[PDB]
Amino acid sequence: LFLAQEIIRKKRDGHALSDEEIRFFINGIRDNTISEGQIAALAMTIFFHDMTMPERVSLTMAMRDSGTVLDWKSLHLNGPIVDKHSTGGVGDVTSLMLGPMVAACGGYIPMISGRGLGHTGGTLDKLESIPGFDIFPDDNRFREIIKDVGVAIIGQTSSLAPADKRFYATRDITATVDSIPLITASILAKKLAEGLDALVMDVKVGSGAFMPTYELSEALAEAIVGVANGAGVRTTALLTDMNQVLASSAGNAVEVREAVQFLTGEYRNPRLFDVTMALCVEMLISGKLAKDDAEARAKLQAVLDNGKAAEVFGRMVAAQKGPTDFVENYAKYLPTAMLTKAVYADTEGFVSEMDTRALGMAVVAMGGGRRQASDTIDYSVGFTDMARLGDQVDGQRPLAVIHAKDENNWQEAAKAVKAAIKLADKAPESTPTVYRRISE
Amino acid sequence: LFLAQEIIRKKRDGHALSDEEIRFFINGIRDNTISEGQIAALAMTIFFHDMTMPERVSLTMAMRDSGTVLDWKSLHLNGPIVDKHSTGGVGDVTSLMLGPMVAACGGYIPMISGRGLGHTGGTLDKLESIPGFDIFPDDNRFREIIKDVGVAIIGQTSSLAPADKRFYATRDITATVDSIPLITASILAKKLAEGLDALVMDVKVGSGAFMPTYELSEALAEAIVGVANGAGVRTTALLTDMNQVLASSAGNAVEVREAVQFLTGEYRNPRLFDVTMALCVEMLISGKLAKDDAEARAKLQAVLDNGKAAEVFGRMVAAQKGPTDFVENYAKYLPTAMLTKAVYADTEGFVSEMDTRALGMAVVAMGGGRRQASDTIDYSVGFTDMARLGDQVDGQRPLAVIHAKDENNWQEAAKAVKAAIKLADKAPESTPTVYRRISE
Numbered sequence: 001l002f003l004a005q006e007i008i009r010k011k012r013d014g015h016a017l018s019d020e021e022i023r024f025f026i027n028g029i030r031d032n033t034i035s036e037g038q039i040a041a042l043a044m045t046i047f048f049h050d051m052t053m054p055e056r057v058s059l060t061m062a063m064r065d066s067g068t069v070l071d072w073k074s075l076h077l078n079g080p081i082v083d084k085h086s087t088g089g090v091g092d093v094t095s096l097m098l099g100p101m102v103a104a105c106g107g108y109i110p111m112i113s114g115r116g117l118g119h120t121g122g123t124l125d126k127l128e129s130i131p132g133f134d135i136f137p138d139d140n141r142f143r144e145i146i147k148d149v150g151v152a153i154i155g156q157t158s159s160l161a162p163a164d165k166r167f168y169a170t171r172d173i174t175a176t177v178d179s180i181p182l183i184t185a186s187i188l189a190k191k192l193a194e195g196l197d198a199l200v201m202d203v204k205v206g207s208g209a210f211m212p213t214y215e216l217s218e219a220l221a222e223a224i225v226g227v228a229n230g231a232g233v234r235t236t237a238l239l240t241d242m243n244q245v246l247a248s249s250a251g252n253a254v255e256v257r258e259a260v261q262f263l264t265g266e267y268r269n270p271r272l273f274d275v276t277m278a279l280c281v282e283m284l285i286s287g288k289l290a291k292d293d294a295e296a297r298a299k300l301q302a303v304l305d306n307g308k309a310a311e312v313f314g315r316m317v318a319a320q321k322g323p324t325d326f327v328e329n330y331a332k333y334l335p336t337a338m339l340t341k342a343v344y345a346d347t348e349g350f351v352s353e354m355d356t357r358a359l360g361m362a363v364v365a366m367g368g369g370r371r372q373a374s375d376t377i378d379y380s381v382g383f384t385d386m387a388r389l390g391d392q393v394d395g396q397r398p399l400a401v402i403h404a405k406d407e408n409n410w411q412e413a414a415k416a417v418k419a420a421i422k423l424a425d426k427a428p429e430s431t432p433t434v435y436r437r438i439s440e
Numbered sequence: 441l442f443l444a445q446e447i448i449r450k451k452r453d454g455h456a457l458s459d460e461e462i463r464f465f466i467n468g469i470r471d472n473t474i475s476e477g478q479i480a481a482l483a484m485t486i487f488f489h490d491m492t493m494p495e496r497v498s499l500t501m502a503m504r505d506s507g508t509v510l511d512w513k514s515l516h517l518n519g520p521i522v523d524k525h526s527t528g529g530v531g532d533v534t535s536l537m538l539g540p541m542v543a544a545c546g547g548y549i550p551m552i553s554g555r556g557l558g559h560t561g562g563t564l565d566k567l568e569s570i571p572g573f574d575i576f577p578d579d580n581r582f583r584e585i586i587k588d589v590g591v592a593i594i595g596q597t598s599s600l601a602p603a604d605k606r607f608y609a610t611r612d613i614t615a616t617v618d619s620i621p622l623i624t625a626s627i628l629a630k631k632l633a634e635g636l637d638a639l640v641m642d643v644k645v646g647s648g649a650f651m652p653t654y655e656l657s658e659a660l661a662e663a664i665v666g667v668a669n670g671a672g673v674r675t676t677a678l679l680t681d682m683n684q685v686l687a688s689s690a691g692n693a694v695e696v697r698e699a700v701q702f703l704t705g706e707y708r709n710p711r712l713f714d715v716t717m718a719l720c721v722e723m724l725i726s727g728k729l730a731k732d733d734a735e736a737r738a739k740l741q742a743v744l745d746n747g748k749a750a751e752v753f754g755r756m757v758a759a760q761k762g763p764t765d766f767v768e769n770y771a772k773y774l775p776t777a778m779l780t781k782a783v784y785a786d787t788e789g790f791v792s793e794m795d796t797r798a799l800g801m802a803v804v805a806m807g808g809g810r811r812q813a814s815d816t817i818d819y820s821v822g823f824t825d826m827a828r829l830g831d832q833v834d835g836q837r838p839l840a841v842i843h844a845k846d847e848n849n850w851q852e853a854a855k856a857v858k859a860a861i862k863l864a865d866k867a868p869e870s871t872p873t874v875y876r877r878i879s880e
Contacts, residue, residue: 009615012487037480041614044484047452174481175449 004034011045019058026062030163036170043167043176051181053226059181060227063189066163070110070195075147079106080287084279085191086202087210087220088120090360091247091386094202094276095123095153096259100312101276102283103150104303105290110146110194111153112160116369119208119360121250124155125369129253129379131333133322145319150312152320161189180216184223188231198234198286200279201225205435206243208356214239214435221438229440234286239435240275244354244389247272251368251382253334254403258384260330263310271388274433282437337380337403343414348394349423351387359383362416367405378405383417390427444474451485459498466502470603476610483607483616491621493666499621500667503629506603510550510635515587519546520727524719525631526642527650527660528560530800531687531826534642534716535563535593536699540752541716542723543590544743545730550586550634551593552600556809559648559800561690564595565809569693569819571773573762585759590752592760601629620656624663628671638674638726640719641665645875646683648796654679654875661878669880674726679875680715684794684829687712691808691822693774694843698824700770703750711828714873722877777820777843783854788834789863791827799823802856807845818845823857830867 007021017025025042028034051059072081082102086092099109116122127133135155137145145152158165164186171177191199203221204210211217221237228235248269249258261267262276281296283289290296303309314327323333363369367378385401387393399417404410447461457465465482468474491499512521522542526532539549556562567573575595577585585592598605604626611617631639643661644650651657661677668675688709689698701707702716721736723729730736743749754767763773803809807818825841827833839857844850 005613005615012484012615035476035613037476037610037614040477040480041484041616044452044481044488048484048488170477173445173475174477175445175452176481 004028004038008038008041008045011042011049014049016052016055017058019054022055022058023062026059026066026163029166030066036166039167039170040174040176043171043174043179043182046181047176047179056181056184056223056227057230059185060188060192061231063161063163063167063185064192066189067161067193068157068159069193072108072110072146072195075143077108077147079108079150080197080289081110081195082107082198082200082283082287083109083111083191083194083196084200084202084283085187087204088117088122089204089208089242089246090119090121090356090363091245091250091255091272092121092204092242093126093247093249093255093259093272094279096126096256096313097262097276097309098280098283099151099153100263100316101280101300101303101309102287103312104308105284105299107150107283107287107289108146109151110142111151112156112190112194113153114156116364119357119364121252121255121360121363121369123153125377126252126255127153128377129256129334130317130322130326133317134320137320145316149315149319151316153316156190161193164189180220180223183220184227187224188227192228192231192233196233198283199228200282200286201228201235201237202275202279203237203239204242205239206241206356207354208242208244208360218438225438225440235440236282236286237438238275238278238282239438240278241271241431241433241435242356243431244356245359245383245386246275248386249382249384250359250363250386251403252377252379254382254384257330257334260310260313260327263304263313264307264327265304271433278434335380338406339404339410340401341404341410342385342398342401343417344395344398345393345421345423346418347423349392349425350427351389351391351393351399351421352424352428353422354389355420358416358420362413362420365416366409366413381405381409387421390430393423444468444478448478448481448485451482451489454489456492456495457498459494462495462498463502466499466506466603469606470506476606479607479610480614480616483611483614483619483622486621487616487619496621496624496663496667497670499625500628500632501671503601503603503607503625504632506629507601507633508597508599509633512548512550512586512635515583517548517587519548519590520637520729521550521635522547522638522723522727523549523551523631523634523636524640524642524723525627527644528557528562529644529648529682529686530559530561530796530803531685531690531695531712532561532644532682533566533687533689533695533699533712534719536566536696536753537702537716537749538720538723539591539593540703540756541720541740541743541749542727543752544748545724545739547590547723547727547729548586549591550582551591552596552630552634553593554596556804559797559804561692561695561800561803561809563593565817566692566695567593568817569696569774570757570762570766573757574760577760585756589755589759591756593756596630601633604629620660620663623660624667627664628667632668632671632673636673638723639668640722640726641668641675641677642715642719643677643679644682645679646681646796647794648682648684648800658878665878665880675880676722676726677878678715678718678722679878680718681711681871681873681875682796683871684796685799685823685826686715688826689822689824690799690803690826691843692817692819694822694824697770697774700750700753700767703744703753704747704767705744711873718874775820778846779844779850780841781844781850782825782838782841783857784835784838785833785861785863786858787863789832789865790867791829791831791833791839791861792864792868793862794829795860798856798860802853802860805856806849806853821845821849827861830870833863
C-alpha cells in the first residue's frame, strides 16, 4: 500500500474495479492524497477499457458522496423534487422557463446549473445579466426559496461533488473528457447530490452538440438513464436538435429577455417551445404530477396561459435578490449593447446549414463568453432575430441582429455569422426537434 | 494551441507522433510547462499503443538532448568511449571490476550509474561505502579523471537528461514503468548523454530480473540495441542470469570487498567472472580494441593477471577522493557490521530455487537499501558466502553469512533468507550464465 497505483494497474490490465477500490480512489481525489498524474492515468485506463454498469454506478455514487448531498424530506413539501440537465448548446435557454413552469405545476426544482463551457452558453452566466441576482444563496436561504417559490437556479459550491472538480480539471487537459462513463458520472454526481425524486436529461444531437454522432449521443443518454434509475431517481432522456440555434437569441441578457417574453406570451420560438414543453412533460410524468403526455401538456399550457409560470419566474428572481419588478420592467435592468445592427447574407436564398459550434464561438469572441476562467463577460452582446433553417433570407430578412460592445467587435461578429451559415437555392429537409425518448 | 493535449489525443487515438511533437513534449517536461497529469496521460497512451521505431528513436534523442551531453573529442584521447549498463540485480557488482578492466585495456569509461531501486542494489550506493569516495565530481574534474585514470563512476546530476527525471517520477506512481519504449528511452537518454562510441547492455533474465519473461527480456534488449545503434553508438546486449545472486555477496561494503578480492585474484565467483568477462568482451570488440572474442579475452585476462586492472581501480578510488591505499588496506576502511553469523537451512539438501527478489528485499529490510528516498543506508549489512544453486547444504555449509547491524535485525534477515530458498533432494539442472547476445 497505498492502493492508488495498484488500482490504476488493475484497470490498466483490463480488470473491473470493485466498489471499494472506486470509493477509495474518489476519496483520495477529494482529500488531495491522489495526484494529478494518478487521476489522469486512471482516466486514460477508463478511456481505453471502458467501465461496466456496476463500475459506472460505483463511480457516480462515489463522486456524489464526496460532498454535500441535499435532502428535502424534512421540509415536508407536497410535491416531487425534480430537475433537468442539458449537455448544452447555443440559445439553449430552456431552464429559465422550464423551472418556473414545472414549479407552477407542483414540482420543486433545486437546479444546480453551470457557467458557459467551450462554445456553449451557461444558465448561470445568463442569470448574472440580471442586476443583483445571486447564484450562491447560503444553505438555509436556498431551502427557504425552494419551499416558498418552488424553484431556484444556483451555482456549484466548493462542497458539492468536490471529487468531480479535480477529476474534470484533469480530464480537460489530458484528452480524457471524451469517455461515456466519465461524462455520465460527472453529470450525475452533481444532479444526484440535489436529492431528486426525478430527473430529465436533454442530450443534444447535431453540429452544436457534445457527442459527435447520433449513436454516441444515444449511447450517452442510455448510460445516464441507466445509472440514475439505479440510484432510485426516476430518469428519462430526450435526444433533441442542436443543428441550429434553439432560441431566437444567443448570449446572456438577450436570452433572459427571450425567456421573459416566452413566459408572458409576447413571443415563443416554436422549436424552443417544443423542446421546453417536451422536457417539462418528462418531469411531470416522472414526478407523478401527471399520468400521461396529454395531461402533462394541458397542465403546462395552463400555467403559461394564466400567467402563473411568469409569476413564479418573477418570484424566483426576487427571492434570489434580483429586482422585485423584473418581469414587468426587465428593459430597465438588462444592459443594452453599444451597437445593435442586422447582418445580412451576401446572397439571397434559403438558410441550409448553420454551424452552431462556430456561432457559439462567435459569441465568445464578442465577449459574451470566456476563453479562460478569469475572463469577464459583457452581458449585453450576442444575437437576436436568428434566422432558422429553411428561412428565405434577403434584404428584408437578415441572418441575425448582432448586439456588439463597440463597432470593431460588430464587424468581426458579422464576419463570423456569415461564415457559419450556408445558403442554398432550396430549403433543407425538415428535422424533428425531439428525435427520441430514452427510459429505463 | 498549446499542443500538449493535442499530442496526447493524437497518441490516444492510435496515431504515430512526429519527431517535432515528441521534441515539443519532452521540452515541455524539461521546462515544467507540461503537468504531471499530462505526462501520465501520454505515458498511458504509450503503454496501450506502443511506439514505432522512429517514435522510440525520437523519444530517446529528445530525452538525451533535454540536458547536458558530454563530448570527448577535444581531450584527444587515444581510445574509444565505452560503457556498460545493467537492468540491475542482487550481487550485480560487475561494474566495479569491468570499468577498471576495460580501462586497463585502452578504453575510456565515463560511467554514470545509479542508486539502488526496488529490490536491486546500486553501484553508487556500493561505492559510497568507501570513505571519502565522491560520486559528484565537477565537470572539469570528471574530465581530468577520465583522461588520467580511464574510468570514473558517478551520479546523475540535475543537468543530465532532466526530462527523464519527471518522466520517470510520474511513471513510477502511475503504473507506466512497464513499457518497452519508455524503458528504452529512459536507459539510453542517460547513457547516450555520455558521448559514447560503444555500449554494452546487460539485460537480466529470471526471478531477480526487471522484465517478467525471457521473451520480454529479449524484446527489451532488441529495442535498446536498435535505438542505440541508430544513434551511432555501437551497441550489443547480453541476456544474463539472475535466478540467483550473481556475486557471492549482496550489500554495499561486502560487495566492494568482493570486487577488490576479484581484481587481486584472492577469490573469483565463477558466475560473476563469466558475466563480467562476457560484458568486457563486448566492450572491447564494439570499441575496436580487439578483433574477436579470443583476442578480447586474452587482453582482459592479461590485465587481471598482471595487476593492472586492480591498479586502475585503486587509482579511480584515489581520484574520486577515496583513500590512496584502498586496494591494499580496504579492511581498515570498509565498515564492519555489529553481528556477522551464518544462517543454516532447516534441512539438508541441494539448493534448488532462490527467490532473488526476496533476497534483495531482505537486504533492504536489513537497512542495506531504501524504501523511500530519504532513507539512510547502513553500509556494513548484507550477505556473504552465498550458497549457489546446486550446492549441498548442511551443518558444514550455510545458506549465507549474514552481516547485521544488531541482533534483532539478524533474526529477521535469517528468517527471510530461509524463506527465499527452496531445497530439493536433487540438484537443479544447470543453466547458462549468458543466454544470448543481441547485436544490430
